[PDB]
Design a protein around this nucleic acid. Structure first.
Ligand SMILES: [Mg+2]
Ligand SMILES: [Mg+2]
Ligand SMILES: [Mg+2]
Ligand SMILES: [Mg+2]
Ligand SMILES: [Mg+2]
Ligand SMILES: [Mg+2]
Ligand SMILES: [Mg+2]
Ligand SMILES: [Mg+2]
Ligand SMILES: [Mg+2]
Length: 153
RNA sequence: CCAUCUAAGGCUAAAUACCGGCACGAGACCGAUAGUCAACAAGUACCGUAAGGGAAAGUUGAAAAGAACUUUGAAGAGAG
């Protein structure tokens, strides 16, 4: 499969990908943008402590109705959240990428997230029941995610 | 006055008609939202107590040669 961005050199880079993940697209996009260029260990720690609710993911684009929190100051924002499902999905994929690098014989401790991208996957349909005998959709919003790690000093 | 038939009984092929049926041939027609509703397990799924109503849906590749094997993950799912 082809990636949206090609790495500057394929020798010092590893790739990971997932499709039709059953996690919210907007939450996943926000937490992916939160970890756009961190070191691998830093990103792992950040996602872990997001799950334990010690640091927040700032919601910048899809922020309508998102409440304020005190941990967005360190991001220079006002609205932050703690999406643990997307955090753990990204954690699993980061682990997969780390294993990928260790297979390709890359220095694990020098990897940074070069390119991360979240798309919208095909949606799956459910039904909800409203007043006066009416039915509206109950669609979910899965996502496809790709990630590239690159050796930097 | 003329003209023309012989009712109240019966039979009779051909020339004529044919959006059903069997078997065929063709077209300045349509080309999968078109052409029959129906190119496909279509009067099927499904709805209505019933009379009845009634869809959506074609295309890998020349050939499955349909991805052995290694690796991360519980797996989906990935990298080679
Ligand atoms: Mg409002
Ligand atoms: Mg209801
Ligand atoms: Mg009701
Ligand atoms: Mg007579
Ligand atoms: Mg007679
Ligand atoms: Mg007769
Ligand atoms: Mg002829
Ligand atoms: Mg077409
Ligand atoms: Mg097609």
């Amino acid at each position: 499969v082809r990636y949206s961005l090609d790495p500057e050199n394929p020798t010092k880079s590893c790739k990971s990908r997932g499709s039709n993940l059953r996690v919210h697209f907007k939450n996943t996009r926000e937490t992916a943008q939160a970890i756009k260029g961190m070191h691998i260990r830093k990103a792992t720690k950040y996602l872990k402590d997001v799950t334990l609710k010690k640091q927040c993911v700032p919601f910048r684009r899809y922020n309508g109705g998102v409440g304020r929190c005190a941990q967005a100051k360190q991001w220079g924002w006002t609205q932050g959240r703690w999406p643990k499902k997307s955090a753990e999905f990204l954690l699993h994929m980061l682990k997969n990428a780390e294993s990928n690098a260790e297979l390709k014989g890359l220095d694990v401790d020098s990897l940074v997230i070069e390119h991360i991208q979240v798309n919208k996957a095909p949606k799956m349909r459910r039904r909800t029941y409203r007043a006066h005998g009416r039915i509206n959709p109950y669609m979910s919003s899965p996502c496809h995610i790709e990630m590239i790690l690159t050796e930097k000093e």
